Amino acid sequence: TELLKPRTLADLIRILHELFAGDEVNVEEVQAVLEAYESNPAEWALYAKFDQYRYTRNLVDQGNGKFNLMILCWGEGHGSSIHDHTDSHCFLKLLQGNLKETLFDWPDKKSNEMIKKSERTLRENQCAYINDSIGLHRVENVSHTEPAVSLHLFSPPFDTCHAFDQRTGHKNKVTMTFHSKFGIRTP
Ligand SMILES: [Cl-]
Ligand SMILES: [Fe+3]
């Protein structure tokens, strides 16, 4: 599979439709092409719709029936739950700012504190990857001064996941909602 550098976000999307044309996913190739796209704010401004109070999920492309590509917009101090990814691949590329990713193991059945296994700072243009076999994660914009924007690819698409209570490991199902689709706010 000949991987070329995406020239623009639209070019990236076209390449992703090629990489997901089939039934399986070459994770390292997808991550490499996502990393190789150099974030250009003008190309994704349409999708980068923020909310004052929490991070937003903005659908960019529905894929070929095979993936959701979305842009998440994180105000200062906004972060996620500890969550899984519903048996899907998750790629996360930073378009602007920085995000802290904290990794957790799947809890045991016993109620116990969830102790982080590691953390890392994801920086502009870097692409991280996670799936349920790797573990769970929390993603947070810990900046006090800089909003963050990330590009997420989920394959297959999913609209529910679990949030985990860090104090006990207990999980609850959450339905994920789109703040916008294709540049259009969807209340
Ligand atoms: Cl995520
Ligand atoms: Fe995630």
Side-chain angles (χ1 to χ4, degrees), residues 1-6 8-108 110-180 182-187:
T1 302
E2 187 192 60
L3 302 183
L4 294 173
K5 179 184 160 74
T8 65
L9 177 61
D11 202 41
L12 173 61
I13 293 170
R14 188 268 305 168
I15 293 160
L16 295 170
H17 277 256
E18 298 176 2
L19 294 176
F20 289 84
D23 286 334
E24 303 289 313
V25 177
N26 187 317
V27 169
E28 301 81 10
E29 290 183 349
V30 175
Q31 185 165 357
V33 301
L34 285 167
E35 183 131 333
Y37 168 57
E38 289 181 21
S39 177
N40 178 352
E43 289 172 3
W44 48 256
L46 175 65
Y47 310 109
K49 301 186 200 303
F50 285 76
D51 178 89
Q52 176 172 340
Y53 303 107
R54 60 153 285 177
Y55 75 93
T56 58
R57 296 182 179 261
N58 302 281
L59 181 66
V60 177
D61 195 84
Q62 271 177 325
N64 49 4
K66 304 266 195 44
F67 69 81
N68 268 352
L69 188 68
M70 58 190 71
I71 282 174
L72 274 60
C73 298
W74 314 79
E76 295 92 336
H78 291 177
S80 73
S81 60
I82 302 169
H83 62 269
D84 68 354
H85 298 86
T86 311
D87 287 306
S88 293
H89 300 281
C90 166
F91 303 82
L92 190 171
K93 183 214 172 58
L94 264 290
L95 297 179
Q96 176 186 292
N98 300 275
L99 292 169
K100 184 170 72 163
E101 185 192 29
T102 303
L103 298 194
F104 295 85
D105 280 323
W106 284 92
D108 293 333
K110 182 170 177 177
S111 170
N112 256 310
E113 176 86 18
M114 303 181 69
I115 299 304
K116 64 173 170 234
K117 92 157 71 82
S118 60
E119 63 176 56
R120 68 174 151 161
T121 298
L122 302 172
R123 308 197 176 275
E124 273 182 26
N125 281 308
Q126 299 181 351
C127 189
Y129 172 75
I130 196 169
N131 66 43
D132 285 352
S133 85
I134 292 168
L136 308 171
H137 73 181
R138 189 195 295 279
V139 177
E140 304 168 274
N141 180 12
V142 301
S143 182
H144 288 262
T145 54
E146 294 304 331
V149 183
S150 50
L151 179 68
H152 297 238
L153 191 160
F154 298 114
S155 183
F158 60 96
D159 45 31
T160 68
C161 69
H162 299 96
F164 296 75
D165 176 4
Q166 189 171 352
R167 302 285 79 82
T168 67
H170 293 167
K171 66 179 161 58
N172 285 280
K173 199 172 174 190
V174 168
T175 285
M176 309 152 92
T177 61
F178 282 123
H179 188 72
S180 70
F182 317 120
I184 306 301
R185 180 80 176 84
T186 54

PDB file of all heavy atoms in Angstrom, residues 90-107:
ATOM      1  N   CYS A  90      -9.244   3.479  17.749  1.00  0.00           N
ATOM      2  CA  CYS A  90      -9.305   4.914  18.007  1.00  0.00           C
ATOM      3  C   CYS A  90      -7.950   5.514  17.686  1.00  0.00           C
ATOM      4  O   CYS A  90      -6.962   5.166  18.335  1.00  0.00           O
ATOM      5  CB  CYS A  90      -9.638   5.193  19.476  1.00  0.00           C
ATOM      6  SG  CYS A  90      -9.343   6.931  20.032  1.00  0.00           S
ATOM      7  N   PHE A  91      -7.914   6.428  16.730  1.00  0.00           N
ATOM      8  CA  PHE A  91      -6.736   7.209  16.414  1.00  0.00           C
ATOM      9  C   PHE A  91      -7.027   8.638  16.802  1.00  0.00           C
ATOM     10  O   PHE A  91      -8.115   9.136  16.527  1.00  0.00           O
ATOM     11  CB  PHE A  91      -6.425   7.172  14.914  1.00  0.00           C
ATOM     12  CG  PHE A  91      -6.232   5.803  14.352  1.00  0.00           C
ATOM     13  CD1 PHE A  91      -7.312   5.027  14.006  1.00  0.00           C
ATOM     14  CD2 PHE A  91      -4.956   5.309  14.130  1.00  0.00           C
ATOM     15  CE1 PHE A  91      -7.141   3.773  13.484  1.00  0.00           C
ATOM     16  CE2 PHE A  91      -4.793   4.029  13.586  1.00  0.00           C
ATOM     17  CZ  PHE A  91      -5.874   3.280  13.267  1.00  0.00           C
ATOM     18  N   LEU A  92      -6.049   9.307  17.398  1.00  0.00           N
ATOM     19  CA  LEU A  92      -6.232  10.654  17.920  1.00  0.00           C
ATOM     20  C   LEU A  92      -5.029  11.468  17.490  1.00  0.00           C
ATOM     21  O   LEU A  92      -3.921  11.216  17.959  1.00  0.00           O
ATOM     22  CB  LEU A  92      -6.321  10.567  19.441  1.00  0.00           C
ATOM     23  CG  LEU A  92      -6.734  11.788  20.238  1.00  0.00           C
ATOM     24  CD1 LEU A  92      -6.924  11.293  21.663  1.00  0.00           C
ATOM     25  CD2 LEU A  92      -5.720  12.903  20.193  1.00  0.00           C
ATOM     26  N   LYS A  93      -5.242  12.439  16.626  1.00  0.00           N
ATOM     27  CA  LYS A  93      -4.180  13.306  16.138  1.00  0.00           C
ATOM     28  C   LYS A  93      -4.429  14.721  16.620  1.00  0.00           C
ATOM     29  O   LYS A  93      -5.529  15.272  16.454  1.00  0.00           O
ATOM     30  CB  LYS A  93      -4.127  13.337  14.622  1.00  0.00           C
ATOM     31  CG  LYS A  93      -2.973  14.176  14.078  1.00  0.00           C
ATOM     32  CD  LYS A  93      -3.353  14.874  12.778  1.00  0.00           C
ATOM     33  CE  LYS A  93      -2.289  15.862  12.314  1.00  0.00           C
ATOM     34  NZ  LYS A  93      -0.970  15.201  12.119  1.00  0.00           N
ATOM     35  N   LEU A  94      -3.421  15.331  17.212  1.00  0.00           N
ATOM     36  CA  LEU A  94      -3.561  16.707  17.659  1.00  0.00           C
ATOM     37  C   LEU A  94      -3.470  17.664  16.488  1.00  0.00           C
ATOM     38  O   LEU A  94      -2.507  17.620  15.719  1.00  0.00           O
ATOM     39  CB  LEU A  94      -2.483  17.076  18.674  1.00  0.00           C
ATOM     40  CG  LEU A  94      -2.869  16.950  20.140  1.00  0.00           C
ATOM     41  CD1 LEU A  94      -3.882  18.017  20.537  1.00  0.00           C
ATOM     42  CD2 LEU A  94      -3.405  15.534  20.393  1.00  0.00           C
ATOM     43  N   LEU A  95      -4.464  18.531  16.353  1.00  0.00           N
ATOM     44  CA  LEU A  95      -4.462  19.592  15.358  1.00  0.00           C
ATOM     45  C   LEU A  95      -4.039  20.933  15.921  1.00  0.00           C
ATOM     46  O   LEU A  95      -3.567  21.787  15.157  1.00  0.00           O
ATOM     47  CB  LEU A  95      -5.843  19.760  14.734  1.00  0.00           C
ATOM     48  CG  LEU A  95      -6.352  18.556  13.975  1.00  0.00           C
ATOM     49  CD1 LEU A  95      -7.733  18.839  13.442  1.00  0.00           C
ATOM     50  CD2 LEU A  95      -5.455  18.181  12.821  1.00  0.00           C
ATOM     51  N   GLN A  96      -4.229  21.155  17.223  1.00  0.00           N
ATOM     52  CA  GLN A  96      -3.888  22.407  17.873  1.00  0.00           C
ATOM     53  C   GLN A  96      -3.768  22.140  19.365  1.00  0.00           C
ATOM     54  O   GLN A  96      -4.599  21.446  19.935  1.00  0.00           O
ATOM     55  CB  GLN A  96      -4.987  23.441  17.643  1.00  0.00           C
ATOM     56  CG  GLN A  96      -4.780  24.762  18.350  1.00  0.00           C
ATOM     57  CD  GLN A  96      -5.994  25.645  18.178  1.00  0.00           C
ATOM     58  OE1 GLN A  96      -6.266  26.104  17.070  1.00  0.00           O
ATOM     59  NE2 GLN A  96      -6.769  25.838  19.254  1.00  0.00           N
ATOM     60  N   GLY A  97      -2.733  22.677  19.980  1.00  0.00           N
ATOM     61  CA  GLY A  97      -2.593  22.597  21.420  1.00  0.00           C
ATOM     62  C   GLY A  97      -1.966  21.282  21.841  1.00  0.00           C
ATOM     63  O   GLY A  97      -1.289  20.596  21.065  1.00  0.00           O
ATOM     64  N   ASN A  98      -2.226  20.925  23.101  1.00  0.00           N
ATOM     65  CA  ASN A  98      -1.697  19.713  23.705  1.00  0.00           C
ATOM     66  C   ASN A  98      -2.801  19.047  24.513  1.00  0.00           C
ATOM     67  O   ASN A  98      -3.669  19.719  25.065  1.00  0.00           O
ATOM     68  CB  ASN A  98      -0.532  20.007  24.677  1.00  0.00           C
ATOM     69  CG  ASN A  98       0.645  20.691  24.006  1.00  0.00           C
ATOM     70  OD1 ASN A  98       1.512  20.032  23.431  1.00  0.00           O
ATOM     71  ND2 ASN A  98       0.695  22.003  24.108  1.00  0.00           N
ATOM     72  N   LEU A  99      -2.722  17.733  24.621  1.00  0.00           N
ATOM     73  CA  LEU A  99      -3.642  16.975  25.448  1.00  0.00           C
ATOM     74  C   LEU A  99      -2.837  15.999  26.273  1.00  0.00           C
ATOM     75  O   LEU A  99      -1.863  15.419  25.779  1.00  0.00           O
ATOM     76  CB  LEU A  99      -4.641  16.182  24.594  1.00  0.00           C
ATOM     77  CG  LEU A  99      -5.653  17.026  23.820  1.00  0.00           C
ATOM     78  CD1 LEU A  99      -6.404  16.183  22.828  1.00  0.00           C
ATOM     79  CD2 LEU A  99      -6.627  17.688  24.779  1.00  0.00           C
ATOM     80  N   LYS A 100      -3.276  15.788  27.501  1.00  0.00           N
ATOM     81  CA  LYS A 100      -2.729  14.760  28.371  1.00  0.00           C
ATOM     82  C   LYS A 100      -3.576  13.508  28.205  1.00  0.00           C
ATOM     83  O   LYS A 100      -4.803  13.548  28.403  1.00  0.00           O
ATOM     84  CB  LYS A 100      -2.756  15.195  29.835  1.00  0.00           C
ATOM     85  CG  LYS A 100      -2.099  14.185  30.748  1.00  0.00           C
ATOM     86  CD  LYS A 100      -1.909  14.693  32.157  1.00  0.00           C
ATOM     87  CE  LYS A 100      -3.199  14.806  32.930  1.00  0.00           C
ATOM     88  NZ  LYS A 100      -2.934  14.917  34.417  1.00  0.00           N
ATOM     89  N   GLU A 101      -2.933  12.400  27.879  1.00  0.00           N
ATOM     90  CA  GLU A 101      -3.569  11.096  27.798  1.00  0.00           C
ATOM     91  C   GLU A 101      -3.095  10.269  28.979  1.00  0.00           C
ATOM     92  O   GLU A 101      -1.881  10.064  29.139  1.00  0.00           O
ATOM     93  CB  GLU A 101      -3.187  10.379  26.513  1.00  0.00           C
ATOM     94  CG  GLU A 101      -3.944   9.056  26.370  1.00  0.00           C
ATOM     95  CD  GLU A 101      -3.418   8.148  25.280  1.00  0.00           C
ATOM     96  OE1 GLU A 101      -2.200   8.202  24.982  1.00  0.00           O
ATOM     97  OE2 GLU A 101      -4.226   7.364  24.733  1.00  0.00           O
ATOM     98  N   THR A 102      -4.028   9.793  29.800  1.00  0.00           N
ATOM     99  CA  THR A 102      -3.731   8.945  30.948  1.00  0.00           C
ATOM    100  C   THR A 102      -4.300   7.567  30.665  1.00  0.00           C
ATOM    101  O   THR A 102      -5.481   7.444  30.323  1.00  0.00           O
ATOM    102  CB  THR A 102      -4.361   9.510  32.220  1.00  0.00           C
ATOM    103  OG1 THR A 102      -3.891  10.845  32.440  1.00  0.00           O
ATOM    104  CG2 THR A 102      -3.994   8.695  33.424  1.00  0.00           C
ATOM    105  N   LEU A 103      -3.460   6.548  30.787  1.00  0.00           N
ATOM    106  CA  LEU A 103      -3.843   5.179  30.492  1.00  0.00           C
ATOM    107  C   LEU A 103      -4.195   4.434  31.762  1.00  0.00           C
ATOM    108  O   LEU A 103      -3.520   4.576  32.787  1.00  0.00           O
ATOM    109  CB  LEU A 103      -2.689   4.432  29.848  1.00  0.00           C
ATOM    110  CG  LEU A 103      -2.177   4.939  28.524  1.00  0.00           C
ATOM    111  CD1 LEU A 103      -1.281   3.876  27.902  1.00  0.00           C
ATOM    112  CD2 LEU A 103      -3.334   5.282  27.588  1.00  0.00           C
ATOM    113  N   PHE A 104      -5.244   3.616  31.676  1.00  0.00           N
ATOM    114  CA  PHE A 104      -5.693   2.771  32.774  1.00  0.00           C
ATOM    115  C   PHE A 104      -5.954   1.365  32.265  1.00  0.00           C
ATOM    116  O   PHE A 104      -6.361   1.156  31.124  1.00  0.00           O
ATOM    117  CB  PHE A 104      -7.014   3.263  33.352  1.00  0.00           C
ATOM    118  CG  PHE A 104      -6.940   4.622  34.000  1.00  0.00           C
ATOM    119  CD1 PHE A 104      -7.071   5.771  33.253  1.00  0.00           C
ATOM    120  CD2 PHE A 104      -6.769   4.742  35.358  1.00  0.00           C
ATOM    121  CE1 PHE A 104      -7.001   7.013  33.857  1.00  0.00           C
ATOM    122  CE2 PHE A 104      -6.710   5.983  35.947  1.00  0.00           C
ATOM    123  CZ  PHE A 104      -6.841   7.115  35.191  1.00  0.00           C
ATOM    124  N   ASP A 105      -5.711   0.401  33.138  1.00  0.00           N
ATOM    125  CA  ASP A 105      -6.078  -0.971  32.852  1.00  0.00           C
ATOM    126  C   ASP A 105      -7.575  -1.163  33.065  1.00  0.00           C
ATOM    127  O   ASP A 105      -8.226  -0.427  33.807  1.00  0.00           O
ATOM    128  CB  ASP A 105      -5.288  -1.927  33.745  1.00  0.00           C
ATOM    129  CG  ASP A 105      -3.884  -2.158  33.236  1.00  0.00           C
ATOM    130  OD1 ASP A 105      -3.701  -2.223  32.002  1.00  0.00           O
ATOM    131  OD2 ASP A 105      -2.967  -2.283  34.068  1.00  0.00           O
ATOM    132  N   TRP A 106      -8.121  -2.171  32.393  1.00  0.00           N
ATOM    133  CA  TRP A 106      -9.476  -2.597  32.683  1.00  0.00           C
ATOM    134  C   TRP A 106      -9.594  -2.968  34.157  1.00  0.00           C
ATOM    135  O   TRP A 106      -8.729  -3.677  34.685  1.00  0.00           O
ATOM    136  CB  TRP A 106      -9.830  -3.784  31.805  1.00  0.00           C
ATOM    137  CG  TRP A 106     -10.115  -3.356  30.398  1.00  0.00           C
ATOM    138  CD1 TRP A 106      -9.225  -3.285  29.383  1.00  0.00           C
ATOM    139  CD2 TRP A 106     -11.372  -2.950  29.870  1.00  0.00           C
ATOM    140  NE1 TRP A 106      -9.848  -2.852  28.243  1.00  0.00           N
ATOM    141  CE2 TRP A 106     -11.173  -2.635  28.514  1.00  0.00           C
ATOM    142  CE3 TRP A 106     -12.650  -2.828  30.408  1.00  0.00           C
ATOM    143  CZ2 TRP A 106     -12.211  -2.191  27.692  1.00  0.00           C
ATOM    144  CZ3 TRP A 106     -13.673  -2.396  29.601  1.00  0.00           C
ATOM    145  CH2 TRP A 106     -13.453  -2.086  28.252  1.00  0.00           C
ATOM    146  N   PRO A 107     -10.623  -2.512  34.855  1.00  0.00           N
ATOM    147  CA  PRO A 107     -10.749  -2.857  36.270  1.00  0.00           C
ATOM    148  C   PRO A 107     -11.055  -4.331  36.461  1.00  0.00           C
ATOM    149  O   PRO A 107     -11.560  -5.026  35.578  1.00  0.00           O
ATOM    150  CB  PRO A 107     -11.903  -1.983  36.764  1.00  0.00           C
ATOM    151  CG  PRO A 107     -12.609  -1.503  35.567  1.00  0.00           C
ATOM    152  CD  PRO A 107     -11.657  -1.566  34.409  1.00  0.00           C
TER     153      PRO A 107
END
